[PDB]
Amino acid sequence: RATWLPGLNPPPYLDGNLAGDYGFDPLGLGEDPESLKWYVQAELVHSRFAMLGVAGILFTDLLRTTGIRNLPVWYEAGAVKFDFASTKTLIVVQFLLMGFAETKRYMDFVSPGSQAKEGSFFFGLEAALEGLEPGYPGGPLLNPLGLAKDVQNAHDWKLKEIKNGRLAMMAMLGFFVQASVTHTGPIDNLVEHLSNPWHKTIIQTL
Amino acid sequence: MRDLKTYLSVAPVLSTLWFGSLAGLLIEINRLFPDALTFPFFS
Amino acid sequence: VRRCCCVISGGVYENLLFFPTIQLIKDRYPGVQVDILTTERGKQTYELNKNVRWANVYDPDDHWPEPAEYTDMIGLLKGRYYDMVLSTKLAGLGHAAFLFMTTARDRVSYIYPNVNSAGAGLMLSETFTAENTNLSELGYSMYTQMEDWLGRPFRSVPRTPLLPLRVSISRKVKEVVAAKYRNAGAVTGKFIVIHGIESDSKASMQSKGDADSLLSLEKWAKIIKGVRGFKPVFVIPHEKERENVEDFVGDDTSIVFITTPGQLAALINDSAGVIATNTAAIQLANARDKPCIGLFSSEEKGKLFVPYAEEKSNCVIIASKTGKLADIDIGTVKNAMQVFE
Amino acid sequence: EFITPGILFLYIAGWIGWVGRSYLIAISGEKKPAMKEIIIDVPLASRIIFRGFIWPVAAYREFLNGDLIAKDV
Amino acid sequence: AHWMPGEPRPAYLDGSAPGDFGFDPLGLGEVPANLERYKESELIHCRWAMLAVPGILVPEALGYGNWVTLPTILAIEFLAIAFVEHQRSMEKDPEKKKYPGGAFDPLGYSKDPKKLEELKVKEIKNGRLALLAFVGFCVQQSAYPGTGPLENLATHLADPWHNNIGDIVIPF
Amino acid sequence: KPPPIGPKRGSKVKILRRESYWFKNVGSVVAVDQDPKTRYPVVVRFAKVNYANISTNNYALDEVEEVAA
Ligand code: CLA
Ligand SMILES: CC1=C(/C=C/C(C)=C/C=C/C(C)=C\C=C\C=C(C)\C=C\C=C(C)\C=C\C2=C(C)CCCC2(C)C)C(C)(C)CCC1
């Protein structure tokens, strides 16, 4: 196959049957297999959060720059004081709810049958948490549509997921650094590049 | 030569190469970024 | 009940094996107008049933159907006013809601071992968890759960078989297939059908759970050279196999083009021998008492798809000693000489 | 004053330690390993020299997996 | 029957004990003797906290005392309580150290063993809940110096999405 | 017995002798004196020398223990 740079064999501890492999592990992090499993779940969650992030930034900035809604810049977006609720409450509520989410995901990763067997009451829903897979929980709660009912033979879907998500993570690092040394939004930097590309790049920042 | 590179990889020759490169690095940093007591970036 | 649907899935082979279930249903309650909502090439089996009423085409495994088509078929099942669904589509919620939107008294389905089957019990009066998620891979029977619940001991005997797979052909399909092999050099009593040819065609009638089920052609050239000619008619799934078979095994070798399973059973009913691999033709040969041999790629797979070889006493089963469909091609010729005469 | 350059230190210091440790483990399966501590296998180290970039996670896993600390036997 | 379904339950507590959910992540109850002493002390702490919490919110609902001299009341307290506590210490049967019965069990609740086990489960659950409630009282009095617990519940019910714990847990 | 009594030639073995340099360290059995009268037959060959620049030493059968690998 095509493994991330020709002229190099992929490492023998990862090949083929994994979501978008391409054999990039020059620093020997997926050498231990359980470490690779943990890192796969880490990658999937990271990429999905990053995809939601890139959507929530690009969409808001399309609304902002064009002028459909007066939303704040991604950089200066956290200090928006909401009337109904406060950020001091929102951090705690996020802690509670995302703890109930991520600890459940974890206890499934270490024990796949968990969260659905016995005394795992979530409003009587102890069946939507069957898991079916590590990193791909499935079930009526998590995939209501069920585009990939099967998940082992869904290599196209998982590959699309992981590729779009690697790219979204790289775009989020872009949002982090591009808007810490330029102090504008991504769409602003884009239209700055699409006016005079050979005069507005990273290195044209003196 | 294979043996010349075997000697260049010996501990003292490689140590002085490594520390000459490193010393040039720190030297040029303390010339370009002299007199440094505090890390001011995101301070 | 009086009106009963069937939302069966898979194609030729899975819907063929459902005939004892339909005969069980009509044996259970006296007059039932059974319907079928199957996939394409599933309707083509239902000339051979003498029991049922509509037998539509839906492709239930589409999983993103045309919403006009989806809404139309939901409303069609509502306008037929069923009493019992009997899905065996092997899906949960999303499809359990599809069976639930039908105004049905008895919502019955199959359910994943996985998660895409949760919240289905709410909308089904029977759960029927299955195995492998590749339901044809379970073998011949595939419906022992549904056979044992339909007709529980509540008043009388279950009667779960009634000499399983009694398919039946009519005179019209008999006449047209009679013309089709009479265009070949076959006599109406003395020939042998095959229906095993390596091809890329969906008329192969194999399974959902079998992969390497169809025998090759040069292996078949060895088989047809080792056997004496009792006029072996060759049943191709597509016309591009005709010249390929005439290149491999010869021009004198008769080729009968059959893609319809009703036409295939009509060609069974005039034959005197069957050299089928794991297709619909083994079960069609066991229907109407024709002596088969039943090639397979595994002894265990042959036991899963034929548990009744000891019963008919003609379908002397042959499989490969390894997997991968490479058998001896010798002793199968020997008991082909034994049982066909 | 201390904490950001302290992290900056510990990142480099653990880089040094981790590439050195993975090097000694790399040559441990040699016939005479000591000659690789004298005659430093520059290809091996250079393939490892950037493997200490990720030491805070690789070392954490080697601690969880049990590969950081050796067993007595 | 598990505090976090998925975690492996240790070998020394598996569901048989009255209040067993497998919450020993630090490994305190490894040995059996310390485990027995712990469940004794747990029941006693539980019963004291369950005596305490209705002695907090009931004065607060009507009296509003906020639950806030020495050399006589202290002496009478020590005299009245050391006697009972040492007489409790003088028992050696452990299931009778946790659940004496006899002169402590009127009304015949301990007459049927299955309901006895269910009521032990009820005691331990309500008691862990009450221990949490007392720790909540203490830390809510530490954070807010001069407010009552029911006063804090009124503060929450007024605007819950603006008066909650967050104000103290993070600097902002 | 005339058959071997001790570990096999090449069996990597651990030393339980508390006074040896290679205590709680693995070895490599190079020979076992099959004479049933010597006290320390197990001739081991270690990888790293002792303070006397010696990589081999005789050990007993009870002062030695083979590893699971
Ligand atoms: C251990 C005690 C000690 C300590 C703590 C210091 C500390 C310092 N000395 Mg003193 N000094 C000492 C002993 C000590 N010295 C001794 C024994 C001598 C006699 C030999 C001297 C003689 C001396 C002189 C004569 C001078 C100093 C100077 C300095 C300052 C150096 C700042 C600098 O240039 O670094 C900057 C940082 C570097 C050089 C390191 C760069 C590392 C590279 C870039 C890698 C990092 C990037 C990497 C990729 C990771 C990034 C993150 C991401 C990629 C993951 C600093 C306050 C200088 C100064 O300014 O005084 C205030 C100076 O003029 N010292
Ligand atoms: C915050 C701070 C502080 C303090 C701190 C402290 C107090 C700490 C402690 C700490 C501790 C108490 C620690 C401990 C540790 C332990 C251990 C036990 C460890 C181990 C480790 C290891 C083993 C590692 C290894 C390695 C690495 C990773 C690197 C390199 C390589 C090697 C291999 C070496 C102060 C205020 C002063 C200042 C500021 C900062």
Curated annotation (Swiss-Prot), chain A:
Entry PTM: Photoregulated by reversible phosphorylation of its threonine residues.
Signal peptide: none
Misc remark: Light emission at 684 nm upon excitation at 410 and 470 nm.
Binding residues for chlorophyll a 4: N164
Residues annotated for chlorophyll b 4 binding in this entry: R105
Keywords: Acetylation, Chlorophyll, Chloroplast, Chromophore, Magnesium, Membrane, Metal-binding, Photosynthesis, Photosystem I, Plastid, Thylakoid, Transit peptide, Transmembrane, Transmembrane helix
Name of this protein: Photosystem I chlorophyll a/b-binding protein 5, chloroplastic
Annotated positions binding chlorophyll a 5: K160, Q178
Bound cofactor: record note: Binds at least 14 chlorophylls (8 Chl-a and 6 Chl-b) and carotenoids such as lutein and neoxanthin.
Segment of the intact protein contained: 46 to 251 of 256
Binding site for chlorophyll a 6: H193
Record: residues binding chlorophyll b 1: W4
Family designation: Belongs to the light-harvesting chlorophyll a/b-binding (LHC) protein family.
Gene disruption: observed consequences: Slightly lower NDH activity in immature leaves. Smaller version of the NAD(P)H dehydrogenase-photosystem I supercomplex (NDH-PSI) supercomplex. In the double mutant lhca5 lhca6, drastic reduction of NDH subunits accumulation upon increased light intensity.
Lineage: Eukaryota, Viridiplantae, Streptophyta, Embryophyta, Tracheophyta
Topological relation to the membrane, as annotated: Multi-pass membrane protein
GO CC terms in record: chloroplast; chloroplast thylakoid membrane; photosystem I antenna complex
Gene: LHCA5
GO molecular-function terms, A-Z: chlorophyll binding; metal ion binding; pigment binding; protein homodimerization activity
Residue spans crossing the bilayer: 49-68, 84-101, 167-187
Annotated localization: Plastid, Chloroplast thylakoid membrane
Entry binding sites for chlorophyll b 2: R48
Any GO BP: response to cold
Swiss-Prot record, chain C:
Keywords attached to this entry: Chloroplast, Membrane, Plastid, Thylakoid, Transit peptide, Transport
Main location per the UniProt record: plastid
Phenotype of gene-disrupted mutants: Malfunction of the NDH complex.
A GO-annotated cellular component: NAD(P)H dehydrogenase complex (plastoquinone)
Subcellular location: Plastid, Chloroplast thylakoid membrane
GO biological process entries: photosynthetic electron transport in photosystem I
Self-association and partners: Part of the chloroplast NDH complex, composed of a mixture of chloroplast and nucleus encoded subunits. Component of the NDH subcomplex B, at least composed of PnsB1, PnsB2, PnsB3, PnsB4 and PnsB5.
Role description: NDH shuttles electrons from NAD(P)H:plastoquinone, via FMN and iron-sulfur (Fe-S) centers, to quinones in the photosynthetic chain and possibly in a chloroplast respiratory chain. The immediate electron acceptor for the enzyme in this species is believed to be plastoquinone. Couples the redox reaction to proton translocation, and thus conserves the redox energy in a proton gradient.
Name of the molecule in the record: Photosynthetic NDH subunit of subcomplex B 1, chloroplastic
Gene name of this polypeptide: PNSB1
Residues included from the entire protein: 115 to 455 of 461
Curated annotation (Swiss-Prot), chain E:
Species this protein is from: Arabidopsis thaliana
Subcellular locations according to the entry: Plastid, Chloroplast thylakoid membrane
Additional note from the record: Light emission at 684 nm upon excitation at 410 and 470 nm.
Name this protein carries in UniProt: Chlorophyll a-b binding protein 6, chloroplastic
Binding of chlorophyll a 5, residues: K122, Q140
Residues that, per the record, bind chlorophyll a 3: E123
Post-translational note: Photoregulated by reversible phosphorylation of its threonine residues.
Residues annotated for chlorophyll b 1 binding in this entry: W3
GO biological process, one term: photosynthesis, light harvesting in photosystem I
Residue numbers binding chlorophyll b 4: R88
Swiss-Prot record, chain F:
Major localization class: plastid
Source species, domain of life: Eukaryota
Gene Ontology CC terms, in alphabetical order: chloroplast; chloroplast envelope; chloroplast thylakoid; chloroplast thylakoid membrane; photosystem I reaction center; plasma membrane; plastoglobule; thylakoid
UniProt PTM comment: 2 isoforms may exist. With or without the N-terminal alanine.
UniProt keyword terms in alphabetical order: Chloroplast, Membrane, Photosynthesis, Photosystem I, Plastid, Thylakoid, Transit peptide
Swiss-Prot/TrEMBL GO biological process terms: photosynthesis
Molecular function in Gene Ontology: mRNA binding; protein domain specific binding
Localization in the cell: Plastid, Chloroplast thylakoid membrane
Task performed by this protein: Stabilizes the interaction between PsaC and the PSI core, assists the docking of the ferredoxin to PSI and interacts with ferredoxin-NADP oxidoreductase.
Family stated for the protein in its record: Belongs to the PsaE family.
Name the record gives this protein: Photosystem I reaction center subunit IV A, chloroplastic
Origin organism lineage: Eukaryota, Viridiplantae, Streptophyta, Embryophyta, Tracheophyta
